[PDB]
Design a protein around this ligand. Structure first.
Ligand SMILES: CCCCCCCCCCCCCCCCCC(=O)OC[C@H](CO[C@@H]1O[C@H](CO[C@H]2O[C@H](CO)[C@H](O)[C@H](O)[C@H]2O)[C@H](O)[C@H](O)[C@H]1O)OC(=O)CCCCCCCCCCCCCCCCC
Ligand code: CLA
Ligand code: CLA
Ligand code: CLA
Ligand code: CLA
Ligand code: CLA
Ligand code: CLA
Ligand SMILES: CCCCCCCCCCCCCCCC(=O)OC[C@H](COP(=O)(O)OC[C@@H](O)CO)OC(=O)CCCCCCCCCCCCCCC
Ligand SMILES: CC1=C(/C=C/C(C)=C/C=C/C(C)=C/C=C/C=C(C)/C=C/C=C(C)/C=C/C2=C(C)CCCC2(C)C)C(C)(C)CCC1
Ligand SMILES: CC1=C(/C=C/C(C)=C/C=C/C(C)=C/C=C/C=C(C)/C=C/C=C(C)/C=C/C2=C(C)CCCC2(C)C)C(C)(C)CCC1
Ligand SMILES: CC1=C(/C=C/C(C)=C\C=C/C(C)=C/C=C/C=C(C)/C=C/C=C(C)/C=C/C2=C(C)CCCC2(C)C)C(C)(C)CCC1
Ligand code: OEX
Ligand SMILES: [Ca+2]
Ligand SMILES: [Cl-]
Ligand SMILES: [Fe+3]
Lengths: 344, 93, 449, 172, 34, 240, 27, 37
C-alpha cells in the first residue's frame, strides 16, 4: 500500500475498450483526452473549411452591415476569413438550435462561436493528450507545459478578450487580414507595444529564433566527419545510434571564444532546458498581457509626459505612436459609435 | 451629396441655416443655446427666418435673443440629410 | 537534509526538500499564513492612512476597504465612508496576529522537530495514509463551513451588510429572509456561464448570497464530518495518485479555477462588489454613457424613441435579439446590465419609454455621469482613460486591478497544476528522473509502421 | 522603433506583404522549434543519476532517447524527426530564411514598391458600396494612421490638415 | 432545431461519459512500469 | 394580455421573446364613443408583423435574418375629426425598425419598417378600419460611410483608392458617379390596419393590420424592392 | 520632512534582514 | 486617515506592506550566505 495501485481487471469488455483507447500501438495515439479532442477538432475543422469557402457575409458589429469573408463571395486566401459573431449577441451562447434557421445563424456569425469553442476544447484536450502519451511511454511529462504557452495565446485571443470586452465580436477573426485588423485595433485601444509583457513576448520570439539559429549553427558546425564529399552529411547519422554525431567540446569552445569562456554552456541538459524555457515564458507573459489588457489594464501611457518651464508639452516618440493610435481609433468601425467615448 | 450649396450656413460661417444647421451652430450667438436653439429646431422648418417668431411655446426672453440674431439667420430649403441630425449630428470633439 | 547530496534537490528546488519533513513543512505553512495576515494588516492600515474622507473609494486605489464597506463597516446610506475606524481595527488585529503566526512559523521551521511522526501521532502523517488525509481535509472543511456561517451570522444579526439594491439607495441592511429554496440557489449552480446567464456570477440580491452561504456552510460541515468519519471508496483509491505533490496539484487546479471565477466576479458582478466602492463595471459605464447622452439629447428636444442612427438602428434606443428595449450603439452588447440607478426605469419589456420621457431623476443623471467618467479603462502607470488619452487623470479602477491580478495568478497557478500533476504521475510510476537505459519502453514496442 | 512600425503599416500596408508574412513564419517557426526541441530533449532524458536534479547527471552516449522522442511525436503529431543532423540544420534554416525574405520585402518598400492593395477588391468596392472585407477595413485604418500622424511625424513638411478634412467615423 | 439539440446533447453526454468513466478506470496503472 | 404583461416582471420576460409581442384584447363586443367635437389621442400603438413578403419579377415568402427586433411599439398620435372624417396623425414613439429578410437565392433584403408621418383615415367598433399613407426615410443617414469611406453628410467625395482614375480631365470618375454621389432617398411604403377586437371598459382596440411599403436603396446605388407585412396591432384611445 | 522619516524606517527594515543573517553567520 | 493618536505612526506604515517582498529576497541572501545560490 503505497502510491499507485498496481492492479488489473481481467479481460472485461470495458477493460478491452480502455485498453484500445490507451493503446500505444495505434499509429495515432487516441487517449481519453483524444476521446474529447477528435470529435471537437473534427466538427471545428469541417465547419471552418465549409464556412471559409462558402459562408455568406456576417453582421459582425451588429450594425446591420454584413462583412464578406468566404472565397465564393469575392475573397482570396489573404483577405478571406471566418467573421466573428454579431455584437448584438455579445457573449450569449448562440448554437444552431437557438436560431430560427441556418440562414439567420450564418448572418449573425454562429460559425465563429462554434469553431472557437470547439477548437479551444480540442486544443486543451490536445495538451492533455501530449501529457498522456508522455505518461504511457514512460517519459518526463513537461512537453504539455511548453505547449501550454500557445494554448494560452489562443485562449487569450479567442475567449478571454471577448469576455473582458463583452462580445465575441472582439475575438480575433479566423483569417489573415482579420488578424491584422485585430492587431491594429488592439494597438489603438490598449497600446500593446508599450506594454512590458508584449515586449517580453517579442523577447521570447526574437530570442527564440536567435537561440534556434545559434544552437543549430553550432551543432551543424561541429558535425563529425562520417560522410563522403558532396554527399549529404545527414547520411552520417543513423536513427537510434548511441554515439554522439557532433563534437560538443568543439562547439562549447567556439562559443567560448566568440564571447567569453564563462558565457558558454557545458551541460547540454541545461542548454536545452534554456532553449525550452525562454520562448515558453515569453509567450506565457504575452498571453497574460492579452488577457489582462482584455480587462483594460493597458500599456504604459507617456502622452504629454514632458513639459517645459512655461508649461507647454514637448512631444516624444510616445506622442507620435499616440498619433498613429489615434488614427486607428478614429477610423475603425466608422459607423459603430454614437457617443464620444469608446468604453466597450 | 458631393456638392451642397448651403455648407457655410451649417456652423462654420457667419450666418446660420435655421432649417438644416445643428443646435451646436447656435452656440455662435450668446443667449440662443440651449433653450432658444432647442425651440427653433423643434419648431422648424420655416419658409422664412421671421417664421421662427411665429412659434408658440416661445418665451419673451427667447423672442428677444432670437430677434437680435434674427439679423443673423437664413432659411434654406430643408434637406433630410442634415434635417434628421439637427440635434445630434455625430459631432463632439 | 539541506544539501544536494543529502536530498537530491538543488537550492532552487530547495523547497522540495520539505516534502517528507512534517515539522519544517508545517513551519513553512504557518510562516506563510503569517505573511498573508501580515500583508492584510499592513495594507489595511496603509489604505486607512492614505484614505481621504470626501472622495469615493475607487478613486483612491483601495481594494481592501471596499470589502469591509461591503460587509457594512463605517458606511452611510449611498456608500459614504464616514467611520474609518473599524477598518483600522481589523488592520491592527490582523497585524498582531501576524506576529503570532510568524513566531509559530519560525519555531516549527527552525527550532522544532523535523518529523512530527516520532514525538507525536496526531499531527504526524504519511502522504500515503488516505484516512489521515481525509481526516485533515474534513477538519478544514468544517472550518470553512464555520467561516461561511460567520458571514451568515454577520449579515443576519450583527448590523447586516451593505445592500446596493436597498429601497432608498445603497444602505446597510439586516437580511431578514434569506433564500433557502434549492430550486433557486442550485438554479445558479446549473446555469450557463454565457451572456444573459452568468452562472454563479449572476447573483444580484443579498438574500440569495447569504442563503447560498447557508447552503455552502451546511454542505462544508456535513462534508467535513463525512470525510472525518469515513475512508475513500475503492474507485477513488484506484483513480487517484496518493502523494503530497499530487494533492498540491489538485489544490492548484482548484485555486486556478477559483482565481478565474473571482476575476469574473470582480469584472461583472455589482452586488457582492458594490459600484459605490469598487467603481462601475465596463458594461455599467458604457450603458452610463448611452444613458447620459440619451438624457442630454432628450433635453435638447429630440424624440429619442424615434431617433434614427447612421446605421438605421436606434441612436439611443433599440431592441435586443429577444425583444427587450435597450440602449443603442455599441452598448447593445451590454444590455444584460442590472444597476440600481437604472432599474427604476426598467419595465416588463425592458426599458420603459414613458419613464424615460418623464421620470428620470437628477441623481440618476449624476450616477450615469460619474460612472461613464470612471470607466474601468487606464494604463499601467495609472493614467485614466482610453489608450490615446493624455496625462491628467490618475486613475485605474479597482475592478481592473483585481480582475487582471487574479487572472495572472489563476493562470500561473494552472501552469503549476500541470507541472506538479505531471511530475506526480511520473514520480508515482517511477520515471520522473529520466528513462531507464536498461528498460526503455519504446524498444519493447512494435514499430509504428 | 514602434513609430517606424506603425509608420510602415499605415503607409506601406507592411502586414499585407507576403515577404513579411514569410518573415513572421520564420520567427514564430524559430521560436516554436526552439521551445519544442528544448522540451522534447528535456522530457526524453535518460536516468543517468539518482537525484531528482537531472542536470547534474551529465560523453559520447546520447543524454536523451531519440527513438522515444520519434515515437512520441509520430503518434501525437503524425510526423517526427529521425535525423539529429537534419533537425539541427532545420532549426538553423527556418529563422534565417525568415529574416532574408522579410529583407526582400523591405527593399521593395525602399522604392515604395508595396504590396498595398488588391485591385480586384478595390474596384469591386468602388462599384459596390455593400461589399466589405477585413482588407478594406485595414485600408481605412491605414488612411487614419496616415493623416493624423502625418501632421506630427513629418514636421518639416509643414502639413496643415484642418479638422474638417481629417478622415474619421461617426462620434469618434 | 430541437432534434438537432437532442442529437448534439446525446453526442456530448456520450463522449463526456467516456472521458470521465474512462479516466476513472485506474489510469495510473496504465504505465510501462506496471 | 395587457394586464398579464403588467403582472409579469422583467426577469420573467427577459429572454423569452415576449418583449417583442403585441398584447391581445379578449373582447369582440362593445364600442368606443367618439364625440366629433372633442379631440382624442391614440396611444400605445403597437404593430407586430407576421409575414414579410418581398415581390419578385407576385410576393414571395422570406426568411427573417435579424431575429426579434422588428416590432413597432409606444407610437403616439392625435385622433382628430376633421370636417367629419376621422383622422389619425402619427407622432412619437418607436415608429421604425431596421429589419433584414432573405429571399430565395440568398440575396439579403434589408428595409426600414416605418410608420413615420402616417396619416390614416378612419372608416370605434369591430367594423372600424384604418388605412393610410406613410413616409419611409433613407435606410442609412447622413453620417453613414460605405466600406470606402463615402457618405451623404460626410466621408470622401471620390473613389480614393483609384487616384489614377481620378487623374484625367473630362471622364473622370464619372463612371463611379453613381457610387460617389450618396443620396438620402425618402420613399413611401403605404399601410392599411383593420381592427377586430374592442374593449370598451379599458378603451383598448386591436385587430389586423395590413401594411404596404417601399424599402433599402444603398444610398441611391440600387433599386428598392416592394415589401409586405402581415400582422396584428394593438392600441388605446385616450382623451386629449 | 516626512520623506526622511520614510527613508529612515525603510533603511531600518531593509537592514533588519541581512543583520539577522550576519549575526547568525557568526555563531 | 489614521486615528489622531497613531497619526505619528504614518511613515512607518508606509513601509509596512513592502516587507513580505523583502522576505522573498532574504531567502536568496540566506542561500548565498550558506554556499548554494
Ligand atoms: C485551459 C484552457 C481552456 C480553453 C477553453 C476550454 C474550452 C471551454 C469551452 C466553453 C468556455 C465557455 C467560457 C465562458 C466564460 C465566460 O464567458 O465567463 C463570464 C461569466 C460571467 O458572465 C456574465 O455574467 C453577467 C452577470 O451580471 C449580471 O448580474 C450582476 C449581478 O450583480 C450585475 O447586476 C450585472 O450588471 C448583470 O449584468 C452577465 O450575465 C453577462 O452577460 C455574462 O457574460 O463568468 C463566469 O461564469 C465564470 C467564468 C469562469 C472562467 C472562464 C474560463 C476562463 C479560462 C481561462 C484559462 C486561462 C489559462 C489557460 C492555460 C492553458
Ligand atoms: C516564504 C516562502 C518560504 C518558506 C516558508 C520557506 C521555509 C523553509 N525553507 Mg525555503 N526557500 C524559499 C522560500 C521559503 N522557504 C525560497 C524563495 C528559496 C529559494 C529557492 C528557498 C530555498 C530553500 C533551500 C535551499 C532550503 C530551504 C529550507 C527551508 C526550511 C528550513 C529553513 C532553514 O533551516 O533556514 C534557517 C534560516 C535561518 C537560521 C535564518 C533565518 C532566520 C529568520 C527567519 C530571519 C527572519 C528575520 C525576522 C523575521 C525579522 C527581521 C523552511 C521550512 C531548507 C530545508 O527544507 O531543509 C530541510 C533548505 O535546505 N529553502
Ligand atoms: C500552492 C503553491 C505552490 C507550492 C506549495 C509549490 C511547491 C513546490 N514547487 Mg511549485 N509552482 C507553483 C506553485 C506552488 N509550488 C506554481 C504556481 C508554478 C507555476 C509558475 C510552479 C512551478 C514550479 C516548477 C517549475 C518547479 C516547482 C517546484 C516546487 C517544489 C520546490 C519549490 C521551490 O524550491 O521553490 C523555489 C523558489 C524559487 C526558486 C523562487 C523563484 C521565484 C520566481 C521565479 C519569481 C516569481 C516572481 C514573483 C511573483 C515576484 C517577483 C520578484 C520581484 C518582486 C523582484 C515545491 C514542492 C520544483 C519541483 O518540481 O520540485 C519537486 C520545480 O522544478 N514549482
Ligand atoms: C491581489 C494583488 C494585488 C492587487 C490587485 C493590488 C492592487 C493595487 N495596489 Mg497593491 N500590493 C500588493 C498586491 C496587490 N495590489 C502586494 C502583495 C503588496 C505588497 C508589496 C502591495 C503594495 C501596495 C502599495 C504599497 C501600494 C499598492 C497600490 C495598489 C493600487 C495601484 C497598483 C499599482 O500601481 O500597481 C503597479 C503594478 C505593477 C508594478 C505590476 C507588477 C508586475 C507583475 C508582478 C509581473 C512581474 C512578475 C514576473 C512577470 C513573473 C515571472 C513569471 C515566472 C513564473 C516565469 C491597486 C489598487 C498603491 C495604491 O494606490 O494604494 C493606495 C500603493 O501605493 N499596493
Ligand atoms: C497550523 C497550526 C498549528 C499546528 C497544527 C501546530 C502543531 C503543533 N505545535 Mg504549534 N504553534 C502554532 C501553530 C500550530 N502548531 C503557532 C501559530 C504558534 C505560535 C504561538 C505555535 C507555537 C508552538 C510551540 C511553542 C510549541 C508548539 C508545538 C506543537 C506540537 C505539539 C503541540 C500540541 O500537541 O498541542 C504540534 C506539532 C510544541 C512542539 O512541537 O514541541 C516539540 C511546542 O513546544 N507550537
Ligand atoms: C482538529 C484538529 C485541527 C484543527 C482544529 C486545525 C485548525 C487549523 N489549521 Mg490545521 N492541521 C491539523 C489539524 C487541525 N487543524 C493536522 C492534523 C495537520 C497535519 C499536521 C494540520 C496542518 C495544517 C497546516 C499545514 C495549516 C493548518 C492551518 C489551520 C488553520 C486554518 C486557518 C484558516 O484560514 O482556515 C479558514 C479560517 C476560517 C474559515 C475562519 C474561521 C475558522 C475557525 C472558526 C476559527 C479560526 C481561528 C484561528 C485561526 C485559530 C483557532 C482555531 C481553533 C479554535 C479551532 C486552523 C487554525 C493553516 C494555518 O494557517 O494555520 C494557522 C495551515 O497552513 N493546519
Ligand atoms: C473540500 C473539498 C473536498 C475535497 C477535496 C473532497 C475530496 C474527495 N471526496 Mg468529497 N465531499 C465534499 C468536499 C470535498 N471532497 C463535500 C462538501 C461533500 C458533500 C457534503 C462531499 C461528498 C463526498 C462523497 C459522498 C464522496 C466524496 C468522495 C471524495 C473522494 C473522491 C473524489 C472524487 O472522485 O471526486 C470526483 C467527483 C466527481 C466526478 C463529481 C462531479 C461533481 C458534479 C458533476 C457536480 C459539479 C457540477 C457543477 C455545477 C459545475 C462545476 C464547475 C466546474 C466543472 C468548472 C475525495 C477524497 C468519495 C469517496 O472516496 O468517499 C469518501 C465519495 O463517495 N465526497
Ligand atoms: C489527431 C492528430 C492530429 C495531428 C495534427 C496534424 C499534423 C499534420 C502534420 C503534417 C506534417 C507534414 C510534413 C511534411 C514534410 C515531411 O514529411 O517531413 C518528414 C520529416 C522527417 O524527417 P527525418 O528526420 O526522417 O529526415 C531525415 C532526412 O530525410 C532529412 O533530409 O519530418 C520533419 O522534418 C520534422 C518537421 C515536420 C513539421 C512540419 C510542420 C508543417 C506544418 C504544416 C504547414 C502547412 C499547413 C497548411 C494548411 C493549409
Ligand atoms: C522559514 C524561513 C524563511 C521565512 C521566514 C518568514 C516568512 C518569517 C515571517 C515572519 C513574520 C510574518 C513575522 C511577523 C511579525 C509581525 C510583527 C512583528 C507585527 C508587529 C506589529 C506591530 C509592531 C504593530 C504596531 C502598531 C500597533 C500596535 C497599532 C498601531 C500602529 C503600530 C505600528 C504602532 C526564509 C524564507 C526567510 C528563510 C529562512 C527560513
Ligand atoms: C455561496 C453562493 C452561492 C452558492 C454556491 C454554491 C452552493 C456552490 C456550490 C458549488 C459546487 C457544488 C461545486 C462543485 C464543483 C465540482 C467540481 C469542480 C468537480 C470537479 C471534478 C474533478 C476535478 C474530477 C476530475 C476527474 C475526472 C473528471 C476524471 C477521473 C479522475 C478525476 C476524478 C481526477 C450562490 C450561487 C447561491 C450565490 C453566490 C454565493
Ligand atoms: C512589524 C514591524 C516591524 C518588523 C519588521 C520586519 C519583520 C522587517 C523585516 C525585514 C526583512 C525581512 C528584510 C529582508 C531583507 C532582505 C534582503 C535585503 C535580501 C536580499 C537583497 C538583495 C539585493 C539580494 C540580492 C542577490 C543575492 C544576494 C542573491 C541572488 C542574487 C541577487 C543579486 C539578486 C518592526 C520591528 C520594524 C516594528 C514595526 C512593525
Ligand atoms: O466592436 Mn470591435 O472594437 Ca472593442 O472598442 Mn468599442 O467595441 Mn468596437 O469599438 Mn473599439
Ligand atoms: Ca373587422
Ligand atoms: Cl456607441
Ligand atoms: Fe539540440
Amino acid at each position: 500500500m503505497t502510491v499507485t495501485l498496481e492492479r488489473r481487471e481481467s479481460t472485461s469488455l470495458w477493460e478491452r475498450f480502455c485498453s484500445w483507447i490507451t493503446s500505444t500501438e495505434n499509429r495515432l495515439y487516441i487517449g481519453w483526452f483524444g476521446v474529447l479532442m477528435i470529435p471537437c477538432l473534427l466538427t471545428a475543422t469541417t465547419v471552418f473549411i465549409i464556412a471559409f469557402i462558402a459562408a455568406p457575409p456576417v453582421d459582425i458589429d451588429g450594425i446591420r452591415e454584413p462583412v464578406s469573408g468566404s472565397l465564393l463571395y469575392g475573397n482570396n486566401i489573404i483577405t478571406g476569413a471566418v467573421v466573428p459573431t454579431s455584437n448584438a449577441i455579445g457573449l450569449h451562447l448562440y448554437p444552431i438550435w437557438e436560431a430560427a434557421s441556418l440562414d439567420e445563424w450564418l448572418y449573425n456569425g454562429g460559425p465563429y462561436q462554434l469553431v472557437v469553442l470547439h477548437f479551444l476544447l480540442g486544443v486543451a484536450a490536445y495538451m492533455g493528450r501530449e501529457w498522456e502519451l508522455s505518461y504511457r511511454l514512460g517519459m518526463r511529462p513537461w512537453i504539455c507545459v511548453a505547449f501550454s504557452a500557445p494554448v494560452a495565446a489562443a485562449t487569450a485571443v479567442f475567449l478571454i478578450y471577448p469576455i473582458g470586452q463583452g462580445s465575441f465580436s472582439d475575438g480575433m477573426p479566423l483569417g489573415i487580414s482579420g488578424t491584422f485588423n485585430f492587431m491594429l485595433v488592439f494597438q489603438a485601444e490598449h497600446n500593446i507595444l508599450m506594454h512590458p509583457f508584449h515586449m517580453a513576448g517579442v523577447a521570447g520570439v526574437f530570442g527564440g529564433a536567435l537561440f534556434s539559429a545559434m544552437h543549430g549553427s553550432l551543432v551543424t558546425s561541429s558535425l563529425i566527419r562520417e560522410t563522403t564529399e558532396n554527399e549529404s552529411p545527414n547520411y552520417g547519422y543513423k536513427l537510434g545510434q548511441e554515439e554522439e554525431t557532433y563534437n560538443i567540446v568543439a562547439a562549447h569552445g567556439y562559443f567560448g571564444r566568440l564571447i567569453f569562456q564563462y558565457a558558454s554552456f557545458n551541460n547540454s541538459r541545461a542548454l536545452h532546458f534554456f532553449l525550452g524555457l525562454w520562448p515558453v515564458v515569453g509567450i506565457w507573459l504575452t498571453s497574460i498581457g492579452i488577457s489582462t489588457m482584455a480587462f483594460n489594464l493597458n500599456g504604459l501611457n507617456f502622452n504629454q509626459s514632458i513639459v517645459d518651464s512655461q508649461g507647454r508639452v514637448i512631444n516624444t516618440w510616445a506622442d507620435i505612436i499616440n498619433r498613429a493610435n489615434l488614427g486607428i481609433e478614429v477610423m475603425h468601425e466608422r459607423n459603430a459609435h454614437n457617443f464620444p467615448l469608446d468604453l466597450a | 451629396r458631393i456638392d451642397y450649396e448651403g455648407i457655410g450656413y451649417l456652423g462654420g460661417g457667419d450666418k446660420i441655416d435655421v432649417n438644416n444647421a445643428n443646435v451646436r451652430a447656435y452656440r455662435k450667438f450668446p443667449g440662443l443655446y440651449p433653450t432658444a436653439a432647442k425651440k427653433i429646431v423643434q419648431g422648424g422648418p420655416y419658409g422664412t427666418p421671421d417664421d421662427i417668431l411665429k412659434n408658440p411655446e416661445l418665451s419673451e426672453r427667447d423672442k428677444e435673443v432670437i430677434k437680435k440674431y434674427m439679423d443673423r439667420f437664413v432659411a434654406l430649403p430643408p434637406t433630410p440629410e442634415y434635417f434628421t441630425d439637427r440635434v445630434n449630428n455625430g459631432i463632439y470633439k | 537534509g539541506r544539501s544536494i547530496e543529502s536530498t537530491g534537490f538543488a537550492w532552487w528546488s530547495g523547497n522540495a526538500r520539505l516534502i517528507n519533513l512534517s515539522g519544517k513543512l508545517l513551519g513553512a505553512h504557518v510562516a506563510h499564513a503569517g505573511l498573508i495576515v501580515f500583508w492584510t494588516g499592513a495594507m489595511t492600515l496603509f489604505e486607512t492612512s492614505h484614505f481621504i474622507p470626501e472622495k469615493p473609494l475607487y478613486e483612491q486605489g483601495m481594494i481592501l476597504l471596499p470589502h469591509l464597506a461591503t460587509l457594512g463597516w463605517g458606511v452611510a446610506p449611498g456608500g459614504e465612508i464616514v467611520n474609518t475606524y473599524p477598518y483600522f481595527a481589523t488592520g491592527v488585529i490582523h497585524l498582531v496576529s501576524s506576529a503570532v503566526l510568524g513566531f509559530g512559523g519560525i519555531y516549527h521551521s527552525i527550532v522544532g522537530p523535523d518529523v512530527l511522526e516520532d514525538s507525536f501521532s496526531f499531527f504526524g502523517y504519511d502522504w500515503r495514509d488516505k484516512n489521515k488525509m481525509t481526516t485533515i481535509l474534513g477538519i478544514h472543511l468544517i472550518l470553512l463551513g464555520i467561516g461561511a456561517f460567520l458571514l451568515v451570522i454577520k449579515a443576519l444579526f450583527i448590523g447586516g451588510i451593505y445592500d446596493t439594491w436597498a429601497p432608498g439607495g445603497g444602505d446597510i441592511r439586516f437580511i431578514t429572509n434569506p433564500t433557502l429554496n434549492p430550486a433557486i440557489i442550485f438554479s445558479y449552480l446549473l446555469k450557463s456561464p454565457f451572456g444573459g446567464e452568468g452562472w454563479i456570477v449572476g447573483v444580484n440580491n443579498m438574500e440569495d448570497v447569504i442563503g447560498g452561504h447557508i447552503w455552502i456552510g451546511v454542505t462544508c460541515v456535513i462534508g467535513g464530518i463525512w470525510h472525518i468519519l469515513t475512508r475513500p471508496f475503492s474507485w477513488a483509491r484506484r483513480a487517484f495518485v496518493w502523494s503530497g505533490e499530487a494533492y498540491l496539484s489538485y489544490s492548484l487546479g482548484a485555486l486556478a479555477l477559483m482565481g478565474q471565477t473571482a476575476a469574473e466576479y470582480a469584472w461583472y458582478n455589482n452586488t457582492v462588489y458594490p459600484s459605490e466602492f469598487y467603481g462601475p463595471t465596463a458594461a455599467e459605464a458604457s450603458q452610463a454613457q448611452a444613458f447620459t447622452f440619451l438624457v442630454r439629447d432628450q433635453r435638447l428636444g429630440a424624440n429619442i424613441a424615434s431617433t434614427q442612427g447612421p446605421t438605421g438602428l436606434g441612436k439611443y434606443l433599440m431592441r435586443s435579439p429577444t425583444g427587450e428595449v435597450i440602449l443603442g450603439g455599441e452598448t447593445m452588447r451590454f444590455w444584460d446590465l442590472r444597476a440600481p440607478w437604472l432599474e427604476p426605469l426598467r419595465s416588463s419589456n425592458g426599458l420603459d419609454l414613458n419613464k424615460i420621457k418623464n421620470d428620470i431623476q437628477p441623481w440618476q443623471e449624476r450616477r450615469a455621469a460619474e460612472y461613464m467618467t470612471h470607466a474601468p479603462l487606464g494604463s499601467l502607470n495609472s493614467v485614466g482613460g482610453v489608450a490615446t488619452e493624455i496625462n491628467s487623470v490618475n486613475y485605474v479602477s479597482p475592478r481592473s486591478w483585481l480582475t487582471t491580478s487574479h487572472f495572472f495568478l489563476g493562470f500561473f497557478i494552472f501552469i503549476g497544476h500541470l507541472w506538479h500533476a505531471g511530475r506526480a504521475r511520473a514520480a508515482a510510476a517511477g520515471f520522473e528522473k529520466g528513462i531507464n537505459r536498461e528498460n526503455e519502453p519504446v524498444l519493447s514496442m512494435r514499430p509504428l509502421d | 522603433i514602434f513609430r517606424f512600425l506603425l509608420f510602415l503599416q499605415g503607409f506601406h500596408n507592411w502586414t499585407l506583404n507576403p515577404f513579411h508574412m514569410m518573415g513572421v513564419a520564420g520567427i514564430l517557426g524559430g521560436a516554436l522549434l526552439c521551445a519544442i526541441h528544448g522540451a522534447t530533449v528535456e522530457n526524453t532524458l535518460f536516468e543517468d543519476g539518482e537525484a531528482s536534479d537531472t542536470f547534474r547527471a551529465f560523453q559520447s552516449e546520447e543524454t536523451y532517447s531519440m527513438v522515444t522522442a520519434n515515437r512520441f511525436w509520430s503518434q501525437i503529431f503524425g510526423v517526427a524527426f529521425a535525423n539529429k543532423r537534419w533537425l539541427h540544420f532545420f532549426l538553423l534554416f527556418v529563422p534565417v530564411t525568415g529574416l532574408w525574405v522579410s529583407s526582400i520585402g523591405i527593399v521593395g518598400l525602399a522604392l515604395n514598391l508595396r504590396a498595398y492593395d488588391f485591385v480586384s477588391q478595390e474596384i469591386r468596392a468602388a462599384e459596390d458600396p455593400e461589399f466589405e472585407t477585413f482588407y478594406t477595413k485595414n485600408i481605412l485604418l491605414n488612411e487614419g494612421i496616415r493623416a493624423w500622424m502625418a501632421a506630427q511625424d513629418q514636421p518639416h513638411e509643414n502639413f496643415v490638415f484642418p479638422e474638417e478634412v481629417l478622415p474619421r467615423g461617426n462620434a469618434l | 432545431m430541437f432534434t438537432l439539440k437532442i442529437f448534439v446533447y446525446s453526442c456530448v453526454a456520450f463522449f463526456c461519459s467516456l472521458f470521465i468513466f474512462g479516466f476513472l478506470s485506474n489510469d495510473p496503472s496504465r504505465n510501462p512500469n506496471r | 394580455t395587457a394586464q398579464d404583461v403588467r403582472q409579469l416582471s422583467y426577469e420573467q420576460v427577459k429572454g423569452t421573446g415576449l418583449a417583442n409581442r403585441c398584447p391581445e384584447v379578449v373582447s369582440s363586443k362593445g364600442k368606443i364613443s367618439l364625440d366629433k367635437t372633442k379631440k382624442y389621442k391614440v396611444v400605445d400603438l403597437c404593430l407586430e408583423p407576421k409575414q414579410f413578403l418581398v415581390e419578385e419579377e407576385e410576393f414571395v415568402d422570406t426568411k427573417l435574418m435579424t431575429r426579434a427586433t422588428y416590432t413597432l411599439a409606444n407610437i403616439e398620435g392625435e385622433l382628430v375629426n376633421e370636417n367629419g372624417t376621422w383622422k389619425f396623425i402619427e407622432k412619437d414613439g418607436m415608429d421604425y425598425a431596421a429589419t433584414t429578410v432573405q429571399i430565395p437565392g440568398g440575396e439579403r433584403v434589408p428595409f426600414l419598417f416605418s410608420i413615420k408621418k402616417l396619416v390614416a383615415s378612419l372608416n370605434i367598433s369591430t367594423s372600424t378600419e384604418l388605412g393610410g399613407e406613410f413616409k419611409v426615410p433613407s435606410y442609412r443617414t447622413g453620417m453613414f460611410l460605405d466600406p470606402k469611406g463615402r457618405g451623404m453628410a460626410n466621408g470622401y467625395d471620390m473613389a480614393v483608392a483609384l487616384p489614377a482614375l481620378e487623374a484625367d480631365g473630362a471622364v473622370g470618375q464619372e463612371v463611379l458617379r453613381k457610387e460617389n454621389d450618396k443620396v438620402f432617398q425618402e420613399t413611401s411604403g403605404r399601410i392599411e390596419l383593420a381592427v377586430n377586437k374592442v374593449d370598451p371598459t379599458s378603451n383598448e382596440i386591436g385587430g389586423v393590420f395590413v401594411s404596404e411599403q417601399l424599402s433599402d436603396t444603398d444610398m441611391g446605388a440600387k433599386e428598392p424592392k416592394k415589401l409586405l407585412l402581415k400582422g396584428v396591432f394593438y392600441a388605446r384611445i385616450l382623451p386629449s | 520632512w516626512q520623506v526622511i522619516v520614510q527613508l529612515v524606517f525603510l533603511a531600518l527594515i531593509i537592514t533588519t534582514g541581512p543583520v539577522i543573517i550576519v549575526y547568525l553567520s557568526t555563531r | 486617515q489614521l486615528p489622531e493618536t497613531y497619526n505619528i505612526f504614518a511613515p512607518i506604515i508606509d513601509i509596512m506592506p513592502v516587507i513580505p517582498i523583502l522576505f522573498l529576497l532574504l531567502a536568496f541572501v540566506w542561500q548565498a550566505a550558506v554556499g548554494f545560490r
